[PDB]
Design a protein around this nucleic acid. Sequence first.
DNA 1: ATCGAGAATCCCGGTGCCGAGGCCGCTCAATTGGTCGTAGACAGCTCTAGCACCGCTTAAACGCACGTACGCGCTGTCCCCCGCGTTTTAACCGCCAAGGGGATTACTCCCTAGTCTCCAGGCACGTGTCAGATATATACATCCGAT
DNA 2: ATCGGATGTATATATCTGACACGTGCCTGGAGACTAGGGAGTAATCCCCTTGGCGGTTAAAACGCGGGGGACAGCGCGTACGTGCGTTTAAGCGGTGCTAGAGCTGTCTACGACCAATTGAGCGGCCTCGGCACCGGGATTCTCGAT
Lengths: 109, 108, 83, 82, 76, 85, 99, 99, 148, 93, 94
Amino acid sequence: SAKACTRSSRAGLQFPVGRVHRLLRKGNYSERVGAGAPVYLAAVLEYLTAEILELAGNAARDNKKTRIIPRHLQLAIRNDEELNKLLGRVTIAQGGVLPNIQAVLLPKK
Amino acid sequence: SAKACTRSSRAGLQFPVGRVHRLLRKGNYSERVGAGAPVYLAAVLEYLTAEILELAGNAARDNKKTRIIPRHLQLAIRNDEELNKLLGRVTIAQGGVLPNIQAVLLPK
Amino acid sequence: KVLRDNIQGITKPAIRRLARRGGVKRISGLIYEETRGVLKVFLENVIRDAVTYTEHAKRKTVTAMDVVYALKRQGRTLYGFGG
Amino acid sequence: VLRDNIQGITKPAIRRLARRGGVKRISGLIYEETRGVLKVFLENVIRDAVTYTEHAKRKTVTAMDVVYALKRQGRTLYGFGG
Amino acid sequence: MQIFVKTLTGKTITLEVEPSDTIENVKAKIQDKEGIPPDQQRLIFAGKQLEDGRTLSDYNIQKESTLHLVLRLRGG
Amino acid sequence: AIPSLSECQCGICMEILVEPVTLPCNHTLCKPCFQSTVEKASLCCPFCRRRVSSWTRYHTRRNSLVNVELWTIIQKHYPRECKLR
Amino acid sequence: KPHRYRPGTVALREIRRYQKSTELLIRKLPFQRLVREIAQDFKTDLRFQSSAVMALQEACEAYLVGLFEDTNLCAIHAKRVTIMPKDIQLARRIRGERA
Amino acid sequence: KPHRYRPGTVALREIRRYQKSTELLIRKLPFQRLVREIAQDFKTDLRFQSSAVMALQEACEAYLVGLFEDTNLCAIHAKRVTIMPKDIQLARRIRGERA
Amino acid sequence: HMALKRINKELSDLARDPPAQISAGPVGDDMFHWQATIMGPNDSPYQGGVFFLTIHFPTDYPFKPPKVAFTTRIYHPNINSNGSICLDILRSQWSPALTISKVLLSIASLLDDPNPDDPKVPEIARIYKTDRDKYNRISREWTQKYAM
Amino acid sequence: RSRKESYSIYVYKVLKQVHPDTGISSKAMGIMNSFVNDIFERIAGEASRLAHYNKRSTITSREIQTAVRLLLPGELAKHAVSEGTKAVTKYTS
Amino acid sequence: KRSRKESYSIYVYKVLKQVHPDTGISSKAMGIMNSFVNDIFERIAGEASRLAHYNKRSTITSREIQTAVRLLLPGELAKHAVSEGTKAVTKYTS
DNA sequence: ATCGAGAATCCCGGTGCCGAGGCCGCTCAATTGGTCGTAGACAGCTCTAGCACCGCTTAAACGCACGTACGCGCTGTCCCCCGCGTTTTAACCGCCAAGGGGATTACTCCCTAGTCTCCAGGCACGTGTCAGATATATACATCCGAT
DNA sequence: ATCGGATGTATATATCTGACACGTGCCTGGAGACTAGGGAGTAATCCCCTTGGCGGTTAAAACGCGGGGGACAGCGCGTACGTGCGTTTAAGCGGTGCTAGAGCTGTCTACGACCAATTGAGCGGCCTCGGCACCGGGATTCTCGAT
Ligand SMILES: [Zn+2]
Ligand SMILES: [Zn+2]
């Protein structure tokens, strides 16, 4: 690239790259840290955040609101299949639970 | 205690204090390692190993054998509440399973 | 300022409410004592680790971060209180 | 090349496992479900083992890779290394 | 001829010796008077360790030259 | 029968047994000495040199370290010895 | 003459209403008093941040909801609609909490 | 005239025998061939150390024994003695492997 | 405190039947400090050897071992110049049931024959294991010029 | 006072990039912060373990890539690897 | 020759001879005990390193190891291990 | 309640083999001694919020009564696992043979840590305003008894 | 299969309030340039162990048959839990006061990192004898059809 702009702007990422580099240095993860690791890690973090935000925004628009509350995040994470497996053990505050009733308990026709 | 003797015997332990210290220092856990940590850690490890081995030897003697084999280790671990709680998810190779038959399945 | 038998504060309607959220239609009459016992055990397990965390730091007030961290150690990650 | 080899997990070879587990009576449809779940578990473990092997620029799946994959999955194994 | 030495204890022992003597013999003299074995003794001349095989005249020890002593303490 | 007065005294403190503890190696010592040893000694019986750690872990949860019958015998048969403690 | 619902429909209505809301389901003061009792049982003379109490209540409520879901699954598996203490015990045994 | 054991007294004998011994239960070569098939499905032209195959077999046997124990417990809970596929599915669902 | 009574019984036990070739007693009013004299055993290279040593009693006895020190000079692979002694019972194999007579007789037994597995001084250790005669005569010109 | 770092402005920028209209409350913001920290710690720890397993002493891009392939499920793993390699390639030149 | 591989075999054998004076141990049991020791070491060291990072410290002092032991081990093993560690440190420092 | 025949399991004595425990040679990692930069231990000050108390609503909890529907025990049918005998299939063991790639070593070069200087990106604080919650009044879906 | 009440839920409109989005000062952390050295990339070699193949023998699998025990459906009983109403209890909200303890700053002293010489603890390789595996015969003990 141009090697003249800021590191985050140079890589096309919105997440900070210098901060990730400092966290890797002071995180006691390895004696040495390469020059390409923070960029890769920031890209992965930004992609995951973008996907979850897109799903949450879709849910919020579905519920006729202009803000993302924890319920929207809970719905977006649980309704998807991959994200639910990724966050299987995670508990979201003010999340509630998906509406499901077993077919046996419903009244007979 | 008096200095000028091997570190592992100053505290009365049998596990190597020097090896534990080197592993802690070069094991990428923290920037600096105190001088009392390896002794404490070696004492804990030795205590646990003795605990496992005493029960394993008791089971081996109860099995009329004079040699400890993994079956004895499994019998010692799974028959103690505390050790079974500690080694919950761990699988011992060639350890078998505890004898247990549900009372309902027994003949009447 | 000691306290006694405060477990009765988790009344029958509260456990009924929790089960209704869970997806339970009909509830027996002996569920409430079992639920209270389970809740008490879980509280003891979490609070022991929380108190250990707040005692290692030479403090006297348990911080929400300590509770979050005890929960994470116990295997129940919690979001929404820092970390 | 190999194909249709899940049948190698034979009916007595599942009856014996059930007998060890503490099962007195076995239905006639247990075997298919057992084969399916065993295949799923093998696939899950072997994927991580092969990834570990491929990272080190190797071509043989050593026991250490399997042990590390099992430890990652939460099924720590003792005896083969570590 | 007496030599001033700053030992570990700091005591300086008066004894008539000569620079022409070997290190083994003066170490034996110290063992006779102070008891420290030659291996345990470690004479220090301006921060330099002297080998037992050589002599005092090699490092130019003179009349009442201020030297040092460290005991090779292995064990105890 | 009755145990001898001299034989009953603790082998560590040279004085009568108080809250005696019966080791799995059927050695009896008074509870203060046993507690001090488990705190400071090598977690072994001083006489026969065998570990009691698993036994101690089992017995401390149910509070069965003290020998009730021997304590009752020593206090009933020798009350003044317990009083002077 | 008075109109009363058939036994069961009110439970379904409550289930539908309660799976849509997100508030907390236990009164604040009794839970705070209980957690204070347990804490003072562990270490005397302790103080609590409000956020710590809130986090504890949230975690406990989520865990209880999950446990009741598993208990309901067990009860339906047993050809029943009611949940009994043996369902809870079996769910805990399977989950490995008590082994 | 021939002596035949009643149905039920032989399975308990097998349970008593197999819970005391520790040898592997599945045959070696079929398991090795299945493992190699899965591996070649993932990456072509792989090689396996014998220790790795033994470790895989040990892990699979332990997992299957645990799963059958839980399945038997569920079946007994359902007022039966026979284990059925729904028992396996319920045990897996509660343990969180498939949800 | 409690250890004072134990020291009383140990002193009485030493008083009634003192052991052979060894004798101990307190130098001053305090019973914590002790000094002892030991003779050279007949079946040893230390014939006619008289040796003095000092004993320090920690405040928690017998739960912790006492400290020993040779105030005299002796040649042995397991004893340093300053008098430090490396034997199993002093720091590694110490139990509350032991008595001062037991450790004194164990020290005498060490003086009877050395322990080569754990030499405190390795140079005289390899000297001793090289050949017996060198150890013989070095013990000679050590014991008839230091002990006597 | 003391400055407390967070991933706030970056997450807000990503949200505006995806949904220009919708906002976000404070509780959701804290939840997103905790999620980002959790994922960061997971990937960093896995990369550290991978580096230590091969007798190495540095964390390059390939260790992060292998950690991502290990942690994330299939489709998410593939998309994340593609995005990461694209970012690294654009950065290096 | 083959490069040196370190293990806890000899120390485990010494402890076993200290517990049971006349009992031998097979090779597979040695491997299992070695793996167990390594696993417990890794657990305690990792928890202590975290807890040191938690309060903005930089040294893994015996206090951190004691807290990690109190956390990881169950009820009674915690007390006994803590007592043994305190005894060892006290005997080592003096 | 029992007696006895057929069958599985446990004990005991003798033989053999291979691997566990001890010994010897040796190399490298732990020890010891000394020096130096900085981490945290301690004393002191600030000031945030955790705790305690008081009064007023009124919302959730509690106790009681009625009824019904579901859990449970019982019976009957049938069909599907189980135990056993016979036959077919391939697992297991011992053997030989080839070569692929894991493991080690030597050499070199370039990538990252460390230091100094400099400056702007993000954090804390303050302010405006509109998205959502709440109150109020209709519209409609749904349930239950009765034909 | 409806049809009427009757109830709860869903929908449209005013309003007002506190939290969200944005603006500004500044300072601490990130960026830029330069130097040194060790970590890692690459080429070459060795030999360990993985793959492949043959022959045998025999333990394990495949198949079939008789039947008995267990799964599953249908019925009846009554008891425990759901629903609704009136009453008692303490949660919830606001407002005020106090101080214990979290948090930040300044000194400095002792603990821990670094480096070099050195030597003994621990690892690799060998060897042997005893503990355990195995076989064969007999004693012991559940099991079931028949009383
Ligand atoms: Zn006593
Ligand atoms: Zn004893």
